[PDB]
Amino acid sequence: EDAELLVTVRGGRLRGIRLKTPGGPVSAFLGIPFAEPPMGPRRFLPPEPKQPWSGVVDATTFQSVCYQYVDTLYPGFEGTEMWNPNRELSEDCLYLNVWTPYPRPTSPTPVLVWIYGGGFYSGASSLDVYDGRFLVQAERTVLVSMNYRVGAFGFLALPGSREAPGNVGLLDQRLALQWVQENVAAFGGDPTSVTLFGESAGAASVGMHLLSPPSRGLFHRAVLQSGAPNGPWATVGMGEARRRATQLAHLVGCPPGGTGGNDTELVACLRTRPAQVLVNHEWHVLPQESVFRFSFVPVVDGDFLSDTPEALINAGDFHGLQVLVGVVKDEGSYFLVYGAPGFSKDNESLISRAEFLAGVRVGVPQVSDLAAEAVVLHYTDWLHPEDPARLREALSDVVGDHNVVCPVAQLAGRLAAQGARVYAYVFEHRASTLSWPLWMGVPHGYEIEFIFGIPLDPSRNYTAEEKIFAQRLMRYWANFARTGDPNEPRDPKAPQWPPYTAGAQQYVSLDLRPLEVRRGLRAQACAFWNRFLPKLLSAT
Amino acid sequence: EDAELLVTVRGGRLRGIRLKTPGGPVSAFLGIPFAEPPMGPRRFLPPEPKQPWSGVVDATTFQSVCYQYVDTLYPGFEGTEMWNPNRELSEDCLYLNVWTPYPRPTSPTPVLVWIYGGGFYSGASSLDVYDGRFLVQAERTVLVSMNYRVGAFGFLALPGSREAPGNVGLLDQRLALQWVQENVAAFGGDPTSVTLFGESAGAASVGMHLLSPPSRGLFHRAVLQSGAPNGPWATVGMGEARRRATQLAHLVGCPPGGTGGNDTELVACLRTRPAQVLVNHEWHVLPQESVFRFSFVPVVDGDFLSDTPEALINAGDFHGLQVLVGVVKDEGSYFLVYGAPGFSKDNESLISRAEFLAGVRVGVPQVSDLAAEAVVLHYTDWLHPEDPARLREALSDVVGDHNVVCPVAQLAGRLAAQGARVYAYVFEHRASTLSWPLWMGVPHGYEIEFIFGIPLDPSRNYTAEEKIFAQRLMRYWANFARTGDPNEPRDPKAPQWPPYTAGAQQYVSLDLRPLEVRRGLRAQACAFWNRFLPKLLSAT
Numbered sequence A, B: 001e002d003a004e005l006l007v008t009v010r011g012g013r014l015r016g017i018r019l020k021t022p023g024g025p026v027s028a029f030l031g032i033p034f035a036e037p038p039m040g041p042r043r044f045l046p047p048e049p050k051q052p053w054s055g056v057v058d059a060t061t062f063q064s065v066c067y068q069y070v071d072t073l074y075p076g077f078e079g080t081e082m083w084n085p086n087r088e089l090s091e092d093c094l095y096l097n098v099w100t101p102y103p104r105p106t107s108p109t110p111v112l113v114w115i116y117g118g119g120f121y122s123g124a125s126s127l128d129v130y131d132g133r134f135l136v137q138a139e140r141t142v143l144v145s146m147n148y149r150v151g152a153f154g155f156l157a158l159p160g161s162r163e164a165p166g167n168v169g170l171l172d173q174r175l176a177l178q179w180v181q182e183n184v185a186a187f188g189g190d191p192t193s194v195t196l197f198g199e200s201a202g203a204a205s206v207g208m209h210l211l212s213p214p215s216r217g218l219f220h221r222a223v224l225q226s227g228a229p230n231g232p233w234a235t236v237g238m239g240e241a242r243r244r245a246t247q248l249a250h251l252v253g254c255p256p257g258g259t260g261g262n263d264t265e266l267v268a269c270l271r272t273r274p275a276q277v278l279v280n281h282e283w284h285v286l287p288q289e290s291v292f293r294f295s296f297v298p299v300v301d302g303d304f305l306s307d308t309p310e311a312l313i314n315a316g317d318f319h320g321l322q323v324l325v326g327v328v329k330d331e332g333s334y335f336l337v338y339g340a341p342g343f344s345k346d347n348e349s350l351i352s353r354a355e356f357l358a359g360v361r362v363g364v365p366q367v368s369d370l371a372a373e374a375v376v377l378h379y380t381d382w383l384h385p386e387d388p389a390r391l392r393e394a395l396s397d398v399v400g401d402h403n404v405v406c407p408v409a410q411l412a413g414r415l416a417a418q419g420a421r422v423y424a425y426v427f428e429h430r431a432s433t434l435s436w437p438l439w440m441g442v443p444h445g446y447e448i449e450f451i452f453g454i455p456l457d458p459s460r461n462y463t464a465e466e467k468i469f470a471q472r473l474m475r476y477w478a479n480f481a482r483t484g485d486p487n488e489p490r491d492p493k494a495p496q497w498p499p500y501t502a503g504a505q506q507y508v509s510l511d512l513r514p515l516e517v518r519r520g521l522r523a524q525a526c527a528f529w530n531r532f533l534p535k536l537l538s539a540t
């Protein structure tokens, strides 16, 4: 029996587990309940705090994954199945995990809180690439990661009603942040040095917590990897969220024809359906004809968000806030095999021009035909307008710029010019173990394994360069967690990472080569999306 | 007695003059009347052929310049006054000039026919930079240049009427071409090998002869330098030409206060006014403030042009036609000192972004606010959106591409893809004796002095390399006159000039360095003007 694997929190006592690392052990507390299981009549409702428990809750294993769609596009394929649930599904899923070094930190230590992505319809804290044992061992920090309700169970919204207010999946993350405020000290973690970091929808969640006052008091720094709240995929209007919710009810037989009708009989009917039935009809309510659109996302109800994320970013004071932000080199390549014609991970996806013009309508949905022409103009090399290899990478940029890179640069510039110290990066190393095809370059999501030190796992066939490279990135993230500056507070030998400003727009390239400063997060392409495209669609 | 300077033509006898070049003499016949003076009741009417004359018409000096506006922006400045009239103004101006080598060619020789530019409101064949004395000596060709009516006298149009049909200045050029068919043999020139070459509005004139069936039978090859018939300034609608003609009549007091204003009494009132009075109100016919918009241009009437130049180029077969087109490196810089805010030839024109925004409306007139913002999008470096030097060259490209480079590249593409062998160039040498400021680069029109071999004039301070460079250019132009191919037929040793195709889009840079092949006549920028902007203006 180790005295360090025993911890008492406000709810009760826990028994953790000792994880091994090629550089020393780590104490892990996997599966801590932080809310009452949102089951039965509590479905679609905001979370309630987990009531205290007698005895010693076992905290040696990941708990269940929240009910979610399982990707079946490429069965057996590692590149897709690494994001699928690796524990069984359940609505009883509101559990968080806490890693802490060995020996336990004696003085208060900075805390990193991870928020998984997955388009607000999937994801789990238990995925092998979110293993925090390597980041906690090498940098002596405290890492926390929670599970939040995805899909309809987390974001079905009948706005105005109290049976389904929406954004309850965001409140789940908030409750885990409130839990960290009250209990991370028991693990050696400093509740006054909390750094949120998430990827994709997780990064969009981090941004929505920057713009929600009740969440701002629970953390002090932010890291948004390949995502932002102002993206065209991360929010939905009240009327549209109502239309999608009523559609889901109809697809599962609600209301029982004919009874109606009001929001209180609809949610009551939805609460009687098995969870898998609700998931079986999730991709069945939206326009049905576009990659990158997710059915149940955060709604702008006026509650969690007083206004749209774009408005709150513009009219917001960000002094005293430090933000690390960045993207990958090829954000859109992995999304093109999910509907874009001519694309297939098992060939070269050398699309024709007809497929390119059709792929733009799928990558950029709900736009006028005139607006589609402007995208084709901006993204065509008119010296080689029919080269398949160039058309493939253009559509990869069309989708990458519209969904990730330009919503991120817009946010980053607006933050720096309004008081926030901002640092920017672009991940430009393709893992030597990557299972996706070569033409996808560095796809969306494949920087996470390096931020979490996964190359240090001796069972994985990573190179010596990637091992040293992962240690560099872990120091960048941890230094930003400790000081708010990814540069070491003393080392002048390592190249300097200059802050990102709305004018200079400086960022660094993260790869095996030393740091290199560059200007412009695709400045030309993003001027089309952020500046010109709204002016057109105003004049339909 | 030198019987060389004595030539008889179908109309009578002429006596010429011997001009000296550093490499030999040349026989010149300057001032040959090819039409009855279009004065009195013949003003605004199509030209009548010159009736035969008794005696020996003197042909040793240039005749009068057609009545035209005189540029007074920079008095005494070489850069502007080199294009101003250098003979007395008169409506008696329909005269042409013929240079021929000494000794006179015995076998038929190919002939170049020059059509001067000047926005259809100015220009004259007598300008020093159009001196054919060097092109004829060095290449043993026949050069012919005529005068045509400009301004209201050449292009005032009350369409459909008999008194002012319009395009009579283009008919003046046609008449000089029919005269070349009937009399060029007398000078040693082959009427079955005549190649038109013009610049700016002259280049647009050459193109309008390709698209007019009666003119097409009078020449075999075409050269268009920095101008094309499909430009936004080269033509005007039928109803707008009527509006401009009636406005000019009002400004000079026509019709008198109390009489009707039908077409036959309007022109009768215009014919009684002194020519200088019509010229003094030519620019008040456009109340709009805009660089590059000229008051009286060729009208699309159905007579000289059965449809618009853009329509005829699209539906035309050009097999058996050799074309040589090209532009200068900085087409629009010469015109920004003519109304663009913040621009002055005597400072650096480091304009502010406000001035760049205002200048776009003046360089691209008659476009919606939504269309101007698209131009600002395409032509702004968004990493340096306020750098004055970059904004200056941006506006220089905006104006140069909209008015010259893209209408030409559009024409060059449709020609090659429909039968015509096309060669393309970009003039990139700035004259060592150029008087315009350094920041204008190679302005519009400053390749002409090298095509005409003016650097060989011993009275000028050109460099030795410009002498050799001018000789090389004259060889290209004459070869294309003989062969239809600017490359020397007896030499694979020199760098080769590949044709211009609608796909490869190859051109060469003409400068002191040897030939260099490049691809794309500013293809990215021209896709905005030729492809997207019509789609934008169609949806209003």
Ligand SMILES: O=C(/C=N/O)NCCCN1CCC[C@H](CCNC(=O)/C=N/O)C1
Pocket (backbone or CB within 6 Å): A071, A283, A290, A291, A292, A293, A335, A338
């Ligand atoms: O990454 C992303 C999206 N980016 O946009 N993943 C989306 C996963 C796919 N999804 C949407 C497309 C439709 C599909 C359901 C089809 N399933 C069947 O069984 C059909 N039988 O006809 C679920």
Ligand SMILES: O=C(/C=N/O)NCCCN1CCC[C@H](CCNC(=O)/C=N/O)C1
Pocket (backbone or CB within 6 Å): B283, B290, B291, B292, B293, B335, B338
């Ligand atoms: O090359 C180009 C075209 N670029 O578009 N030249 C344009 C010809 C110049 N023109 C501009 C507008 C009219 C103005 C006449 C005013 N003259 C006065 O004396 C007024 N006193 O109030 C001179």
